[PDB]
Amino acid sequence: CPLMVKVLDAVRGSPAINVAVHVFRKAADDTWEPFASGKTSESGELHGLTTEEEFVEGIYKVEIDTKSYWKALGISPFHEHAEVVFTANDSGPRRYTIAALLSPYSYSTTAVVTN
Amino acid sequence: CPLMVKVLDAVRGSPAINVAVHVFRKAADDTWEPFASGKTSESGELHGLTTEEEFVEGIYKVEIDTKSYWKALGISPFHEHAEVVFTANDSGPRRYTIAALLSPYSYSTTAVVTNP
Amino acid sequence: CPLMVKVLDAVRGSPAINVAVHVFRKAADDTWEPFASGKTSESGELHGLTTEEEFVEGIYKVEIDTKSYWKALGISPFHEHAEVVFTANDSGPRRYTIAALLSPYSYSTTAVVTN
Amino acid sequence: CPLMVKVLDAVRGSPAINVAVHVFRKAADDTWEPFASGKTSESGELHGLTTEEEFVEGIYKVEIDTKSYWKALGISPFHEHAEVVFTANDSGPRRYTIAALLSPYSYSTTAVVTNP
């Protein structure tokens, strides 16, 4: 489990469930090559995106479809999406948790990186 | 300003208007002594709390009545209030902005501290 | 497990380990009566603070000793502590996770409340 | 301002000074067209990006070079940048402040949107 995404809802005080998440790797022509995707579970989590062997050093983008989430809840959002862009494994393979906290007009994102 | 408080509403993307703010300073006997109070303006700011002279070294507490703000909008929020507790002017006078960003079940707070 | 506290470090990108956490209940004379305490684990979590039967409706305060944490890391902090004050169980017993994300001059706190 | 960007440093409790910001607008063929750029001032603000006339309806992207900011301070941060993507002026002209609060392994961003 090298990469996990966790999404929380600051309005309802709950996991953000059924949020679409797309993961991309930066290709050698600086285009984003899509890589993995899924929807958050009932606990707001998305596991199983990639494997140790596949998740090589590179620049990755995680795109979280916040706008659809807020629309599904009948709440007007500001952002198209929340994007998180980071270089992976620069000092060795790590386990990455990308956590995002969502409000309609704000979001925060944090990485929890462990050995 | 020696002390300013700024409050934003993360649901609406707006200043949080008419939010009550109470400031306290810790006394020599460790109680909380009322220091100043006010409410946020149309810009979500509260100015004029104190003066450089009055704002001496000490531990201050800023209590933002976030509950009453959300209740007035129909929302039953998680938090009773947002409180920010800090030592001020330990290395000489500084200007403090206390910013809070409010959601029903979350808040964040940040300090910007500048040397005049 | 009616009440859990989770603390993350935004500087290091890690759980906040060995952070002291005190929990209080508001007494009938409006004083804070201390109630439970502990230190966060290696995963930044604190479990086992209270039981279903004990965690009755009331106003609770969770005080997280951020200042000691930052001092232990040799980083100058702004806040004395992060406090979270909330009324519990107003519509029935819930499971409460209090999550805090720490930076030296900022913190955020969110509640994840589930049935 | 039709568009202002404000950046704060959560480690130091200060404005984030000299942070590069690039703004893009999505074209009719779905590419990202350069729109404006600048760097934050001593107050951590960037003004003068656009004008009411130029800032028409569309999807905009604000990319804040947070990596270079942290690297200059000796820190290897998590994020390459902070990017904020949003539809602007969908219901008529509005004033947008995009605020970002930066930590090495975290950032938050908020929009304050006002009607002149």
Side-chain angles (χ1 to χ4, degrees):
Chain A
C1 280
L3 177 65
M4 190 266 281
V5 179
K6 190 177 302 178
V7 187
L8 298 181
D9 176 342
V11 169
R12 296 196 313 172
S14 74
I17 307 160
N18 295 322
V19 179
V21 175
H22 295 258
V23 185
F24 307 86
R25 182 209 296 283
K26 198 149 187 284
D29 67 10
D30 290 337
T31 69
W32 288 113
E33 182 176 322
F35 172 82
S37 60
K39 286 176 155 304
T40 58
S41 72
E42 76 175 290
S43 70
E45 296 177 6
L46 179 59
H47 304 256
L49 291 163
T50 187
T51 64
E52 296 286 349
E53 335 198 358
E54 177 183 67
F55 192 47
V56 295
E57 288 190 287
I59 300 181
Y60 294 85
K61 172 168 86 176
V62 175
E63 189 176 314
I64 302 166
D65 181 10
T66 59
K67 186 180 192 177
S68 302
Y69 177 76
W70 294 115
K71 288 169 47 79
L73 290 173
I75 296 171
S76 189
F78 178 74
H79 305 92
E80 290 295 298
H81 58 249
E83 244 153 22
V84 183
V85 182
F86 65 96
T87 299
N89 301 314
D90 185 81
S91 189
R94 302 277 182 275
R95 294 226 321 175
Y96 295 84
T97 297
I98 304 307
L101 179 70
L102 307 183
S103 299
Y105 274 69
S106 185
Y107 65 84
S108 73
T109 188
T110 317
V112 182
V113 185
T114 55
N115 291 339
Chain B
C1 307
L3 183 62
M4 190 265 277
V5 178
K6 184 177 177 54
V7 188
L8 296 175
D9 177 329
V11 172
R12 295 187 286 170
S14 74
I17 308 182
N18 199 35
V19 177
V21 175
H22 290 261
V23 185
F24 308 88
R25 184 183 179 275
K26 208 168 190 184
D29 63 345
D30 286 350
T31 68
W32 289 108
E33 288 274 339
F35 182 86
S37 67
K39 58 177 218 140
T40 61
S41 76
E42 278 182 13
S43 65
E45 302 188 349
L46 177 48
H47 295 273
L49 285 166
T50 191
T51 62
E52 188 158 20
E53 292 99 348
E54 191 186 39
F55 191 40
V56 294
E57 296 196 64
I59 304 176
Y60 295 82
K61 169 161 74 160
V62 174
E63 188 184 330
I64 307 174
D65 184 8
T66 63
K67 186 177 185 184
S68 295
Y69 176 75
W70 291 114
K71 287 289 188 164
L73 290 172
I75 290 161
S76 298
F78 180 78
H79 301 92
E80 292 296 296
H81 59 246
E83 69 184 305
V84 181
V85 185
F86 68 100
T87 297
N89 309 302
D90 161 51
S91 325
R94 294 293 188 279
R95 300 201 343 166
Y96 299 85
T97 298
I98 303 308
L101 176 68
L102 306 184
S103 302
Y105 279 73
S106 184
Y107 64 91
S108 68
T109 188
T110 311
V112 182
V113 182
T114 64
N115 188 355
Chain C
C1 280
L3 177 65
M4 190 266 281
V5 179
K6 190 177 302 178
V7 187
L8 298 181
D9 176 342
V11 169
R12 296 196 313 172
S14 74
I17 307 160
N18 295 322
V19 179
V21 175
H22 295 258
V23 185
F24 307 86
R25 182 209 296 283
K26 198 149 187 284
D29 67 10
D30 290 337
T31 69
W32 288 113
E33 182 176 322
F35 172 82
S37 60
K39 286 176 155 304
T40 58
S41 72
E42 76 175 290
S43 70
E45 296 177 6
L46 179 59
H47 304 256
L49 291 163
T50 187
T51 64
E52 296 286 349
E53 335 198 358
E54 177 183 67
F55 192 47
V56 295
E57 288 190 287
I59 300 181
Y60 294 85
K61 172 168 86 176
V62 175
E63 189 176 314
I64 302 166
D65 181 10
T66 59
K67 186 180 192 177
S68 302
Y69 177 76
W70 294 115
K71 288 169 47 79
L73 290 173
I75 296 171
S76 189
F78 178 74
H79 305 92
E80 290 295 298
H81 58 249
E83 244 153 22
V84 183
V85 182
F86 65 96
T87 299
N89 301 314
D90 185 81
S91 189
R94 302 277 182 275
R95 294 226 321 175
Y96 295 84
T97 297
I98 304 307
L101 179 70
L102 307 183
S103 299
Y105 274 69
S106 185
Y107 65 84
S108 73
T109 188
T110 317
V112 182
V113 185
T114 55
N115 291 339
Chain D
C1 307
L3 183 62
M4 190 265 277
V5 178
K6 184 177 177 54
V7 188
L8 296 175
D9 177 329
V11 172
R12 295 187 286 170
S14 74
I17 308 182
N18 199 35
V19 177
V21 175
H22 290 261
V23 185
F24 308 88
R25 184 183 179 275
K26 208 168 190 184
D29 63 345
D30 286 350
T31 68
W32 289 108
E33 288 274 339
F35 182 86
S37 67
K39 58 177 218 140
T40 61
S41 76
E42 278 182 13
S43 65
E45 302 188 349
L46 177 48
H47 295 273
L49 285 166
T50 191
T51 62
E52 188 158 20
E53 292 99 348
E54 191 186 39
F55 191 40
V56 294
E57 296 196 64
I59 304 176
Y60 295 82
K61 169 161 74 160
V62 174
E63 188 184 330
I64 307 174
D65 184 8
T66 63
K67 186 177 185 184
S68 295
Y69 176 75
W70 291 114
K71 287 289 188 164
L73 290 172
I75 290 161
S76 298
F78 180 78
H79 301 92
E80 292 296 296
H81 59 246
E83 69 184 305
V84 181
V85 185
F86 68 100
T87 297
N89 309 302
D90 161 51
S91 325
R94 294 293 188 279
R95 300 201 343 166
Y96 299 85
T97 298
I98 303 308
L101 176 68
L102 306 184
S103 302
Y105 279 73
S106 184
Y107 64 91
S108 68
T109 188
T110 311
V112 182
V113 182
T114 64
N115 188 355

